[PDB]
Design a protein around this ligand. Structure first.
Ligand SMILES: *Cc1c(COP(=O)(O)O)cnc(C)c1O
Ligand SMILES: *Cc1c(COP(=O)(O)O)cnc(C)c1O
Lengths: 360, 360
C-alpha cells in the first residue's frame, strides 16, 4: 500500500515524506526522468490550448514523422489511446492483410488486456512446427523483441532472425510489440538495435511522455489497408507534446550510452552483492532495461523465470524499500533506469542491495 | 478530415483558422467548457509534481469521496485508466459476485472495445424472457441508462424500474454504465435523476476532466470482493486533479438548470427548423445530452434509430460545418452542450440549422 506525493528526476516522494530512487519509471514512459523541466514547460503551454480535442491535430504529424524517421519498419503510423489498443489494431490488421486467422504469441508475453497458438519464448522450433502444421493459416507472429513482463528476458542468438525467416517463408507477418522497448532499448527500438525489421510495430509508453498514448505502424502497403471502411480515437495533444519533447531529448548525444553505463554497473553490482552472500541469481540489462531473477537460471523463457524464489524476492523488495529503493513489486516486471539517474544514485542502490541481501 | 488547433469554452478553432460552436465536447468530458481556467490552473500546479505516478496518490481519495457522495449506489469505488477498462472490471465483478456466467446487453449499447445475451433496448419483455429461460445463470444486466451511442435514446417509462425488478427477482445484478451519463444527466448521474439504484456503476469521461480515466463502484459487499487476489492500474494524477475541479464547478448553483435550458431551446429549435421545411424528424435532450434523428420515429431502440436517413444527416452535417457548427459526424452519436454555451451560441446554431435545412 505505498502512496505517492510527487516524483521528479530519478526520485519519488511518498505521503509520509520518504524519498526513494525509482527503478520503475511509471512502468516505462519516464525515460528522461520524472518531471523533466523542458517537458513540463512544453506541457504548460499546450495545456492552454486544451487538454483534449477528440479529433486530430498537427502534433500528430510532427510526432509521426519523428517516429517514421526513428523506426525502420515504420513507413506509416497511426495513433490511438493506449498501447493495448495499438496491439489490438495491429492484430486486426495482420489478419485483414493476410486474410488468415491464426496468430502466434509466446507464453510470458503481454500485449494488454483456435485463433491463438502460443509457444514458449526463445523456442524457434516450436514456432517452426506450428507453421509446418498450419502452413496457410498463420497471419503472423507477435512478440516483445525483449521481454519485460515475465521478468526481463532478452532474445537468444538467432531467435528474431529465425522469426523473420519463417514469416517470410510462409507468407506471414512479423509484428514487434515495442510499447516498452520502443525508444528505450535504442532510439530505433529493439528492431533497430538487433538489426531485424518486422512488418509491423506497436509503440507507446515513452512516446506519450508519461501521458497515455499508443501507435502502430509498418510497411506502407500494409498500413494503406487502414482506410475509410474496415479496419474519435486520435492522440491526446498533451501526450503528443510530451512525446515530441521526450524524443528530442533522447536524440541528444550521450543518452543511450548513459543508460547502458549506469544499468550495467547496477545489474552487475546487484549480481555481485547477492553472490557476495551465497544467493543463486542471474540477470542482465539492455540499455535502460534490466532484471535480476532469484535462480541461477539462466532465464531464456517464462517457465524458467517461474523458477525464481519468490519468497526471497519479496523479502529483498521489502528490504530495498526500507533502504530507500523502489523496485517493481513483482519478480516478473523488468527494471528501468532514466537519464536522471546518476552514477552516485547507482552506488547507493548497490549499498542498499548489500545491506539487504546480507540478512536473508 | 478536420484538424484542430485549439479549443476553449464552447468553441473550436481549426488549422485553417475557422471557429466553430462545439456540440461534441471531446466526446463527453468537456461539460464545464473546454480549457476552463480554474481547471487549467489546477493542472499547471499538479503538472509540476509529475504527469504520472504508476502508483496511487491522495487525489484518488479526494475524488473517491466526492464520487461516493454524489452517486447513490456508489459506496466504494476503484479507479482505472479508461471507461472501457472500468466496464471490463465491472463484468468480471458481476460474475465473481454472482458466481454466474451470462450477462444481458442491449443492441445499440456501447461499453468500449454463450456468456452474452442481448436484447433490444427499452424491451422489458425480451429481458424477462431471458430470465425465465436462464433463471439461475444471469449474473446481471448492464446498460447505458440513457443511450448516447445509437443516437440518443432515453429510457421508456418503467423500463429501468423493470430492470431493477427482475434483477432482484432472479438474484442478479443491475449494472449501469454511466461513463457518459455520469455527472452529465445530473450530478448524481442518471441513476439519481430517475431515482433507480443499480448494484454497480461505471464512471469516466467527465470525472477525468478531459484526461483519460475510469471508475467502477457500488454496494460495499460487492466491491469488497475486489481484494488482494481475484479480481499498476491507478488513476493518473492530472486526470484526478481535473476531475476534482470539474465536479466542484458542477456542484455550484445553476449548472444543471443551465444545461437543461439551452439544450431544450437547442433541440426544440432544431426540430422546429426541420419541420419548417417538411423534413420528418424527432429527438430530445436530457440535461446536456441530446439528439435529433432524420425519421419521424419516435426512436426507443436501435433498429428504430437505423431508420434515419443517413444521406440527409450527412448533408445536414456538412452544411452545419460550413455554417460554423460542429456536430458529431455520425447520426448515431448524441450531442453535448456545456456550461460555456450561451443562449446567444444556441440561436446562432438554430439560424445555421434553418439556413442549412432549407436547402435539402
Ligand atoms: C504496458 C504494455 C502494453 C500495454 O500498453 P498500455 O499503454 O498500457 O495500454 C503493451 N505491450 C507492452 C510490451 C507493454 O509493456
Ligand atoms: C466512451 C464510452 C465508454 C468507453 O470509455 P473510454 O473512457 O472511452 O474507455 C464506455 N461507456 C460509455 C457509455 C461510453 O460512452
Amino acid at each position: 500500500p505505498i502512496v505517492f506525493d510527487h516524483v521528479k528526476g530519478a526520485h519519488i516522494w511518498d505521503v509520509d515524506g520518504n524519498q526513494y530512487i525509482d527503478y520503475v519509471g511509471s512502468w516505462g514512459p519516464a525515460i528522461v526522468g520524472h518531471a523533466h523541466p523542458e517537458v513540463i514547460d512544453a506541457l504548460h503551454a499546450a495545456l492552454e490550448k486544451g487538454t483534449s480535442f477528440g479529433a486530430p491535430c498537427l502534433l500528430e504529424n510532427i510526432l509521426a514523422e519523428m517516429v517514421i524517421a526513428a523506426v525502420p519498419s515504420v513507413e506509416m503510423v497511426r495513433f490511438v489511446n493506449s498501447g493495448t489498443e495499438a496491439c489490438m489494431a495491429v492484430l486486426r490488421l495482420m489478419r485483414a492483410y493476410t486474410q488468415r486467422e491464426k496468430v502466434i504469441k509466446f507464453e510470458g508475453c503481454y500485449h494488454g488486456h483456435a485463433a491463438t497458438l502460443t509457444a514458449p519464448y526463445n523456442d524457434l522450433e516450436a514456432v517452426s512446427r506450428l507453421f509446418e502444421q498450419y502452413p496457410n493459416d498463420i497471419a503472423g507472429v507477435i512478440l516483445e523483441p525483449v521481454v519485460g513482463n515475465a521478468g526481463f528476458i532478452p532474445p537468444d542468438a538467432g531467435f528474431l532472425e529465425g522469426l523473420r525467416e519463417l514469416t517470410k517463408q510462409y507468407g506471414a507477418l512479423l509484428v514487434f510489440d515495442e510499447v516498452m522497448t520502443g525508444f528505450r532499448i535504442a532510439y530505433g527500438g529493439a528492431q533497430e538495435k538487433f538489426g531485424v525489421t518486422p512488418d509491423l510495430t506497436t509503440l507507446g509508453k515513452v512516446i506519450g511522455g508519461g501521458l497515455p498514448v499508443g501507435a502502430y505502424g509498418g510497411r506502407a502497403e500494409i498500413m494503406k489497408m487502414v482506410a475509410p471502411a474496415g479496419p474519435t480515437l486520435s492522440g491526446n495533444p498533451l501526450a503528443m507534446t510530451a512525446g515530441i519533447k521526450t524524443l528530442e531529448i533522447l536524440s541528444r548525444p550521450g543518452s543511450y550510452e548513459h543508460l547502458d553505463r549506469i544499468t550495467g554497473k547496477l545489474v552487475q553490482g546487484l549480481l555481485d552483492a547477492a553472490r557476495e552472500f551465497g544467493h543463486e541469481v542471474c540477470g542482465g540489462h539492455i540499455s535502460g532495461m534490466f532484471g535480476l531473477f532469484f535462480t541461477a537460471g539462466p532465464v531464456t523463457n517464462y517457465e524458467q523465470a517461474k523458477q525464481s524464489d519468490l519468497k526471497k524476492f519479496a523479502a529483498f523488495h521489502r528490504g530495498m524499500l526500507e533502504q530507500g529503493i523502489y523496485l517493481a513489486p513483482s519478480q516478473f516486471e523488468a527494471g528501468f533506469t532514466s537519464l536522471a539517474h546518476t552514477e552516485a544514485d547507482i552506488e547507493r542502490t548497490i549499498a542498499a542491495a548489500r545491506t539487504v541481501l546480507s540478512q536473508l
